[PDB]
């Protein structure tokens, strides 16, 4: 579901990721997703408009927008957080990547 | 570059030209239009023409591809900008 962050049921490429695909669009076997990376790994010189910083638990995470990917639903694990309140920042990052707003 | 289709298996580069990743690029793979019936949404999966063949943009299979794998430019679909923009916006924002 849109704006919810999940865990990857596989042990290899992602820790966490944000589902950014519309809830009105059923692929149905896949889902558009943006992986999250620990905010410490990136300096604060990196655009927060293209790579917004989100908070889950007591940690900061960077949305790796440019690494968006289609992930099959059978690999989407447990719901970890709901970032609906960051809708505006997430929408802007995606729109910037495609339409250079 | 945006709206240009490349090879390695065809795909359309849909990422802004103002945004350098730089090592990767947002892309939408193309599949032969014969493989899908015409009951499949042309709004979410627009039909494009390259050469003397029809292709379906597999929007829901969008992916980040490393630039070193992007081959020869095959076509420029800039004139289909509106349909491509609508398909992407539909997938994310359910317009
Ligand atoms: Cl947050
Ligand atoms: Cl066309």
UniProtKB/Swiss-Prot annotation, chain B:
Q: Which UniProt keywords apply?
A: Plasmid, Repressor, Toxin-antitoxin system, Transcription, Transcription regulation
Q: Is-annotated flag, keyword Transcription? A: yes
Which GO terms label this protein's molecular function in UniProt?
Answer: DNA topoisomerase type II (double strand cut, ATP-hydrolyzing) inhibitor activity
Upon gene disruption, the observed phenotype is: Disruption of both ccdA and ccdB has no phenotype, except for increased plasmid loss.
One Gene Ontology BP term is: negative regulation of DNA-templated DNA replication
A Pfam family hit: CcdB
GO CC terms: toxin-antitoxin complex; transcription repressor complex
Q: List the disulfide bonds.
A: none
Has UniProt tagged this entry with the keyword Transcription?
Answer: yes
The entry assigns this protein to a family as follows: Belongs to the CcdB toxin family.
Q: State its role.
A: Toxic component of a type II toxin-antitoxin (TA) system, functioning in plasmid maintainence. Responsible for the post-segregational killing (PSK) of plasmid-free cells, also referred to as a plasmid addiction system. Half-life of over 2 hours. Cell killing by CcdB is accompanied by filamentation, defects in chromosome and plasmid segregation, defects in cell division, formation of anucleate cells, decreased DNA synthesis and plasmid loss.
Question: How would you summarize the oligomeric state and partners of this protein?
Answer: Homodimer. Forms a complex with GyrA, probably a tetramer GyrA(2)CcdB(2), in which GyrA is inactive. Forms a complex with antitoxin CcdA; there are both high- and low-affinity binding sites for CcdA such that both CcdA-CcdB(2) and CcdA(2)CcdB(2) complexes can form. The CcdA-CcdB(2) trimer is sufficient for rejuvenation, whereas maximal operon repression occurs with CcdA(2)CcdB(2). When the CcdA:CcdB ratio is lower than 1, a CcdA(2)-CcdB(4) complex is formed which is devoid of repression activity. In this case repression is alleviated and both proteins are produced.
The name on file for this protein is Toxin CcdB
